[PDB]
Every structure is written in structure tokens, then in C-alpha cells.
Enzyme design. Structure first.
Site, PDB file in Angstrom:
ATOM      1  N   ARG C  51      35.915 -30.956 -46.684  1.00 47.75           N
ATOM      2  CA  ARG C  51      36.590 -32.253 -46.745  1.00 47.75           C
ATOM      3  C   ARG C  51      36.667 -32.810 -45.350  1.00 47.75           C
ATOM      4  O   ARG C  51      37.299 -32.234 -44.477  1.00 47.75           O
ATOM      5  CB  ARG C  51      37.989 -32.081 -47.357  1.00 47.75           C
ATOM      6  CG  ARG C  51      38.743 -33.400 -47.540  1.00 47.75           C
ATOM      7  CD  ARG C  51      39.830 -33.261 -48.581  1.00 47.75           C
ATOM      8  NE  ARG C  51      40.897 -32.318 -48.188  1.00 47.75           N
ATOM      9  CZ  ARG C  51      42.023 -32.648 -47.546  1.00 47.75           C
ATOM     10  NH1 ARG C  51      42.258 -33.908 -47.122  1.00 47.75           N
ATOM     11  NH2 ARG C  51      42.957 -31.706 -47.317  1.00 47.75           N
ATOM     12  N   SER C  52      35.931 -33.897 -45.117  1.00 54.62           N
ATOM     13  CA  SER C  52      35.913 -34.539 -43.815  1.00 54.62           C
ATOM     14  C   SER C  52      36.437 -35.943 -43.959  1.00 54.62           C
ATOM     15  O   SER C  52      35.662 -36.876 -44.125  1.00 54.62           O
ATOM     16  CB  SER C  52      34.469 -34.596 -43.275  1.00 54.62           C
ATOM     17  OG  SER C  52      34.510 -35.081 -41.952  1.00 54.62           O
ATOM     18  N   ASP C  53      37.760 -36.095 -43.858  1.00 55.34           N
ATOM     19  CA  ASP C  53      38.406 -37.368 -44.122  1.00 55.34           C
ATOM     20  C   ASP C  53      39.401 -37.745 -43.014  1.00 55.34           C
ATOM     21  O   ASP C  53      40.135 -38.716 -43.134  1.00 55.34           O
ATOM     22  CB  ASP C  53      39.089 -37.340 -45.484  1.00 55.34           C
ATOM     23  CG  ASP C  53      40.069 -36.176 -45.653  1.00 55.34           C
ATOM     24  OD1 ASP C  53      40.562 -36.052 -46.782  1.00 55.34           O
ATOM     25  OD2 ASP C  53      40.307 -35.408 -44.699  1.00 55.34           O
ATOM     26  N   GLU C  54      39.308 -37.086 -41.856  1.00 56.20           N
ATOM     27  CA  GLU C  54      40.155 -37.484 -40.714  1.00 56.20           C
ATOM     28  C   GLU C  54      39.389 -37.859 -39.439  1.00 56.20           C
ATOM     29  O   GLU C  54      39.982 -37.895 -38.345  1.00 56.20           O
ATOM     30  CB  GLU C  54      41.190 -36.402 -40.407  1.00 56.20           C
ATOM     31  CG  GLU C  54      41.966 -35.981 -41.645  1.00 56.20           C
ATOM     32  CD  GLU C  54      43.258 -35.264 -41.334  1.00 56.20           C
ATOM     33  OE1 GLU C  54      43.884 -34.738 -42.282  1.00 56.20           O
ATOM     34  OE2 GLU C  54      43.653 -35.218 -40.158  1.00 56.20           O
ATOM     35  N   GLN C  67      30.912 -19.809 -49.160  1.00 53.85           N
ATOM     36  CA  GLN C  67      31.132 -19.063 -50.384  1.00 53.85           C
ATOM     37  C   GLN C  67      32.396 -19.491 -51.135  1.00 53.85           C
ATOM     38  O   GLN C  67      33.062 -20.477 -50.770  1.00 53.85           O
ATOM     39  CB  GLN C  67      31.179 -17.571 -50.076  1.00 53.85           C
ATOM     40  CG  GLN C  67      29.775 -17.057 -49.557  1.00 53.85           C
ATOM     41  CD  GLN C  67      29.798 -15.613 -49.161  1.00 53.85           C
ATOM     42  OE1 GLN C  67      30.650 -14.840 -49.606  1.00 53.85           O
ATOM     43  NE2 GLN C  67      28.878 -15.228 -48.285  1.00 53.85           N
ATOM     44  N   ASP C  68      32.683 -18.758 -52.214  1.00 50.33           N
ATOM     45  CA  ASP C  68      33.664 -19.262 -53.197  1.00 50.33           C
ATOM     46  C   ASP C  68      35.033 -19.424 -52.539  1.00 50.33           C
ATOM     47  O   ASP C  68      35.488 -18.526 -51.840  1.00 50.33           O
ATOM     48  CB  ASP C  68      33.858 -18.291 -54.381  1.00 50.33           C
ATOM     49  CG  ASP C  68      32.534 -17.718 -54.907  1.00 50.33           C
ATOM     50  OD1 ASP C  68      31.875 -17.056 -54.106  1.00 50.33           O
ATOM     51  OD2 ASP C  68      32.218 -17.902 -56.084  1.00 50.33           O
ATOM     52  N   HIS C  73      38.045 -28.111 -43.139  1.00 50.54           N
ATOM     53  CA  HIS C  73      38.776 -29.383 -42.940  1.00 50.54           C
ATOM     54  C   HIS C  73      39.071 -29.487 -41.454  1.00 50.54           C
ATOM     55  O   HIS C  73      38.840 -28.527 -40.738  1.00 50.54           O
ATOM     56  CB  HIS C  73      40.081 -29.388 -43.761  1.00 50.54           C
ATOM     57  CG  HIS C  73      40.758 -30.716 -43.753  1.00 50.54           C
ATOM     58  ND1 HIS C  73      42.012 -30.921 -43.220  1.00 50.54           N
ATOM     59  CD2 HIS C  73      40.350 -31.916 -44.232  1.00 50.54           C
ATOM     60  CE1 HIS C  73      42.341 -32.202 -43.340  1.00 50.54           C
ATOM     61  NE2 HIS C  73      41.355 -32.822 -43.976  1.00 50.54           N
ATOM     62  N   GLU C  76      42.962 -34.625 -37.195  1.00 51.62           N
ATOM     63  CA  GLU C  76      42.493 -35.968 -36.874  1.00 51.62           C
ATOM     64  C   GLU C  76      41.832 -36.010 -35.495  1.00 51.62           C
ATOM     65  O   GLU C  76      42.332 -35.445 -34.523  1.00 51.62           O
ATOM     66  CB  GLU C  76      43.659 -36.959 -36.949  1.00 51.62           C
ATOM     67  CG  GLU C  76      44.778 -36.655 -35.973  1.00 51.62           C
ATOM     68  CD  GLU C  76      46.067 -37.365 -36.326  1.00 51.62           C
ATOM     69  OE1 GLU C  76      46.003 -38.562 -36.678  1.00 51.62           O
ATOM     70  OE2 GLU C  76      47.139 -36.726 -36.263  1.00 51.62           O
ATOM     71  N   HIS C 109      33.717 -15.321 -48.908  1.00 52.93           N
ATOM     72  CA  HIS C 109      34.690 -15.810 -49.915  1.00 52.93           C
ATOM     73  C   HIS C 109      36.101 -15.925 -49.406  1.00 52.93           C
ATOM     74  O   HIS C 109      36.619 -14.990 -48.801  1.00 52.93           O
ATOM     75  CB  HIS C 109      34.746 -14.842 -51.093  1.00 52.93           C
ATOM     76  CG  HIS C 109      33.399 -14.334 -51.540  1.00 52.93           C
ATOM     77  ND1 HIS C 109      32.594 -15.009 -52.444  1.00 52.93           N
ATOM     78  CD2 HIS C 109      32.766 -13.165 -51.263  1.00 52.93           C
ATOM     79  CE1 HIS C 109      31.510 -14.278 -52.688  1.00 52.93           C
ATOM     80  NE2 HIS C 109      31.580 -13.171 -51.953  1.00 52.93           N
ATOM     81  N   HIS C 114      38.908 -24.207 -39.689  1.00 52.48           N
ATOM     82  CA  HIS C 114      39.622 -25.493 -39.604  1.00 52.48           C
ATOM     83  C   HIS C 114      39.422 -26.103 -38.233  1.00 52.48           C
ATOM     84  O   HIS C 114      39.627 -25.443 -37.203  1.00 52.48           O
ATOM     85  CB  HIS C 114      41.123 -25.284 -39.831  1.00 52.48           C
ATOM     86  CG  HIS C 114      41.825 -26.558 -40.166  1.00 52.48           C
ATOM     87  ND1 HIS C 114      42.100 -27.527 -39.216  1.00 52.48           N
ATOM     88  CD2 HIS C 114      42.246 -27.051 -41.353  1.00 52.48           C
ATOM     89  CE1 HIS C 114      42.690 -28.552 -39.813  1.00 52.48           C
ATOM     90  NE2 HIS C 114      42.786 -28.282 -41.112  1.00 52.48           N
ATOM     91  N   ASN C 194      21.438 -15.219 -49.921  1.00 52.39           N
ATOM     92  CA  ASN C 194      21.926 -16.555 -50.282  1.00 52.39           C
ATOM     93  C   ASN C 194      20.859 -17.625 -50.221  1.00 52.39           C
ATOM     94  O   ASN C 194      20.927 -18.591 -50.980  1.00 52.39           O
ATOM     95  CB  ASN C 194      23.117 -16.981 -49.433  1.00 52.39           C
ATOM     96  CG  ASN C 194      24.431 -16.471 -49.975  1.00 52.39           C
ATOM     97  OD1 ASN C 194      25.065 -17.128 -50.811  1.00 52.39           O
ATOM     98  ND2 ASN C 194      24.872 -15.328 -49.470  1.00 52.39           N
TER      99      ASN C 194
HETATM  100 ZN   LIG Z   1      30.231 -11.633 -52.155  1.00 52.25          ZN
HETATM  101 ZN   LIG Z   2      43.391 -29.583 -42.550  1.00 50.86          ZN
END
Ligand SMILES: [Zn+2]
Ligand SMILES: [Zn+2]
Ligand SMILES: [Zn+2]
Lengths: 205, 205, 205
Positions: C51-54, C67-68, C73, C76, C109, C114, C194
Site C-alpha cells: 500500500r503506497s498511499d502516503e 509472501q502470504d 507501507h 508520509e 510469510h 515499513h 518462487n
Molecule cells: Zn513458506
Molecule cells: Zn504504515
């Protein structure tokens, strides 16, 4: 669909689809992929990811629960040349698994069990806990934020919150679950509730 | 739908649907189930799971944020015989909750608050942190990977990264947030940004 | 759709959509929002949230895997007055990023990186690990449950499982990856697998 086959890869010539007991409840916002067997009355909550796409089965026994955000995955168990990687396989009752989760096991929110691994019956794997390259015995409790890596945890022991156990010498000296221990009845209560939640959620689908 | 009622169970005779302020933004890839109240201008991010299906409300106050992968859930608060389990209920301002999250609280990515629990206003619950059977005061900071289990954290204290606090004697001696402390302004900044993100995401729906 | 633009905010006048190499595989149950660049042959698993929203880009290099349950993120990088917040930006090869993930990196996983943060090539970020306000060098291993906050990790070092590194003096004395070290070949194996999984999943879409 959120219940899917695994893909064809050099490690996996034939796709497999999950085998799911009709009494199990899989939330629409969970993901279950590949060679997975899910037993009776199991509840799989939102955001859990059960992904078996590197060979060998991930097995979840009867009346177990896989809570929100839990991840189950495993290291490759067959290399490209078709040769089984024995270090990455666990054996339980004569059968081979990438991950084996026994009966009446709770995998609590945000925990992860990564193969090779086995978790014995009536064990509570606490919130945010982690199990990898380990065998956890029956009637164990991993408190929240504990971890077992590369060890065998004997039956009936607990790992205190936050403790990361990486050596067999540590695991051998873990404390015993007794009736007065704070989490001694936690798993039985959580299993009882989740078996009933699975039935209630099934009635809304 | 990703906003859903909880199911009928022996602990829950009547399904409840979430009560969500019209100014809140719930991401389509979040899950919100059952007896949940979400306040004004709250942002609920992808992969969060807020699940109230064992009795009693989960409350998220105004201008709080529930970030990616956060889980909110609670232990049963009513047993099968209709009897309230008082150990699993928190009281805040005369009302009972399974989980209470106050106003201007940030639940940062991958954290978890599991009932019974209360988190006071203007508190930052850091990335991957964990709160269970605890009351966290106002103006607190749980740094990333900290945990509070079974304790009351006094107002205006912080828990250093990675520390797992399980005894009241430890909690009583936690350090105070001061102006020069590295996370002293983090929550206010994160709240300000998330209130604006919620409005921006609402304009795309 | 699970691949989405970020919203208009005071910190972000113009929405951006993700730039995703055609050979990458994004699982339908992952979320990718905003100013994100994803390189060739990258696999993004179920329940990951990027999520790149700042402000500022989140970059994921070629042949990396997310991975899962992994979250990416960032804090700002541009305040309301249009002024770039330099403390929250990392520079790599003359370009500025909120989060930079190099080539052949595994984000295993439930880990989280951040921003501001950079992770150098051929590094394994282990299960449930955490990186924030840090630069991790090339050929590093963060074992499961380790964390690096506010530090630079030199090339070719590892952080033992569960260790939370918050001071440069600690980071400077981390042990070196050697051929006999248990995770010395883990990343190369995981990358190889992968890249092949991404191709196999692409053939099912
Ligand atoms: Zn694994
Ligand atoms: Zn964050
Ligand atoms: Zn729970």
C-alpha cells in the site's frame, strides 16, 4: 474461487485440489490452495492462508481451528529431479506430510506453522506464535508470541509468552502444564467454541 | 459481502450486524463481522479482520485506525447457560465491552488486540504488537513488537520495542512518554494522516 | 479490483496506479494500491498488502517474492505544504523511495517492511520479521522473528531468530553469513522456487 488447485511446476507434475470434509467451514475470505486435507468440524477464519504448492500434503485434523491471519505453508519436499527431500518431510503414524496438524488443535490468530512441522492433538498454538522445523507434542501450549524452531517439544509442556526456543536443551527443560497453570484449559474451551461457530457459520452459507 | 452478521450459536441467540458510522471507510478487502461499533472517520485497511462472534461488543472509537492485517477478536463473554463470564468483560465509563478501542487510537499494521482488552484514547499500538487481557491507558505508546498480557499500563507510558510485559510490577515501572521521546508525536501524525486517507478512499467508492 | 490507485489527499494531488511487469503474478487475494513498481517474475501471495498511499514509490525488484500476509507501507514522505520529509525517504542509486526492495529478495510469510526502509539484493527477510527505518545490506539473513529498527545492517550479516536490533552498535557486531551457517542457502532456494511458482500460477489465470 478461494479454494483452488496448486499449479504445475517442475516440483509438481499434477495439480491437486483440497479435500475438505463437508462439515468444515471455510470463510470466503480465507485462501486454501493445493494438496490440503481438512478434517471434520474445522473452522478456517478470514484472512487465513493455507497453501500447499511445494509438494506433500498439509493435513488439518478433526475439530481443529485455523484462526484469522494464520499461515500454513511448507518448504519444498520434492526437488526438480523428482527426489524427495527427507529433511523437509515429517512422518506421523507411518505417513509423510509437509505439515501435520492433529485433532482438537487451535492455531490462534496470526500464528504460523511452517513445514516441516507437526503439531500433536489437543495443543494450543497461541496468538502470533511460530512453529518451524519442529515437532510439538500433544497437550502442549505455546503462549502468545512464543516460537519453536528446530526442536521437539515434549508432550504436556508449555512455552512462556515471548520465548523463542531454538535448542533441544531448552525444549527438554520447558515447564509442565498443570491444572493450576493459567492456560491449562484454554484449548479445550477454544475447541468447543469453534466447533459450534463452524456449525453456525455453515447455516449462513 | 465483507460486512456480515455473526451466526446463531448457543452463546448468541440473536445475530447482530456491525454499526458503522457513515464517515468511516471499510476497505473491500477487510472483514467486519458481528457485534461491532465503528466510530466516525475510522479507516479500516486491507486484510484487517474485526470479528465479534462470541458475545459482547467490540467498539472502535472516533478517528481511530485499524491498519493492514490487524486482528480484533475476543474470548467468550457469555457461556452456554446464559451466564456472563465477568473475567472476559471490560468496563469503560459504565458500559461493558469485549474489546474497547478509544478515540484517536492507531492499531498499526499486523498488531492484534484480543479481548478482554481496553485501549485508551490517543494511544499508538505499534506494528506487530499484541495486547490481551490488558488495559492500556491514554497517551501510551506500544513500540513495534511489544506486548502487554494480563496487565494495566498506566497513562502516558511506553513499552520499548520487543518487550513482552506480563507482570504488573513490570508495567508499573515502564518509562514515561516525554517530548524528546522518539515516538512522542507518532500517534498524532498517524491519526491526522489516516483521517484524511479515509476521506480520500471514500471518494473512490 | 485488487490492484487499485491511491486516493487524492492533501499529500497526494495526483492518483498513481501500480506499474507491474507482465511476468509478475499478483494473487487475486493480495492487495496492491498506489505508487508501486513490481519487477519481473515477482510472486505476490494471498493476503499480502502492498500500500503506497502516503507519497513516494514502493519498489519491488526483479525475481523477489512477497509472501502470504506480508505488509509493505510507508510513513508520509511529503507533508501537506508540499515539502518533502527527508527523514522518511531512502536514496538508492540516485533515486528516492519510500520503500526499496532489491532484486532476488524473499519477504517471507507475515514479515513487514515499513518505510523508510531499503533491503539490498539476495537478502532473506524471515517469517514474522520486521524492518523499519533501516537499511538492510545485500546477502543478509533476518531469521524468523528478528527485527531491525533504526539501523544499517552491513552486507553479509545475519540476525538470529527473535533478536530485535535497535542500536547501530549492535548491528555493527552481528555475525557473518558463512557457507556452514544454517540459512546460508535459504534465499537462493526460495527465490528459485518462487520464480517457478509465479510462472505456474500465471498459467492458471
Ligand atoms: Zn513458506
Ligand atoms: Zn504504515
Ligand atoms: Zn480470539
Amino acid at each position: 474461487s478461494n479454494i483452488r488447485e496448486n499449479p504445475v511446476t517442475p516440483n509438481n507434475p499434477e495439480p491437486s485440489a483440497p479435500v475438505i470434509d463437508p462439515t468444515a467451514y471455510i470463510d470466503p475470505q480465507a485462501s486454501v490452495i493445493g494438496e490440503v486435507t481438512i478434517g471434520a468440524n474445522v473452522m478456517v477464519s478470514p484472512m487465513a492462508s493455507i497453501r500447499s504448492d511445494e509438494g506433500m500434503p498439509i493435513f488439518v485434523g478433526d475439530r481443529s481451528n485455523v484462526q484469522d491471519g494464520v499461515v500454513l505453508h511448507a518448504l519444498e519436499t520434492i526437488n526438480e529431479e523428482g527426489e524427495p527431500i527427507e529433511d523437509n518431510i515429517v512422518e506421523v503414524d507411518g505417513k509423510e506430510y509437509a505439515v501435520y496438524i492433529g485433532n482438537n488443535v487451535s492455531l490462534a490468530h496470526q500464528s504460523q506453522v511452517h513445514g516441516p512441522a507437526a503439531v500433536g492433538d489437543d495443543t494450543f498454538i497461541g496468538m502470533q506464535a511460530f512453529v518451524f522445523k519442529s515437532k510439538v507434542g500433544n497437550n502442549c501450549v505455546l503462549e502468545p508470541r512464543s516460537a519453536a524452531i528446530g526442536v521437539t517439544i515434549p508432550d504436556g509442556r508449555y512455552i512462556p509468552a515471548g520465548m523463542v526456543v531454538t535448542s533441544q536443551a531448552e525444549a527438554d527443560k520447558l515447564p509442565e502444564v498443570t491444572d493450576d497453570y493459567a492456560y491449562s484449559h484454554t484449548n479445550e474451551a477454544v475447541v468447543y467454541v469453534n466447533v459450534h461457530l463452524a456449525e453456525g457459520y455453515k447455516e449462513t452459507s
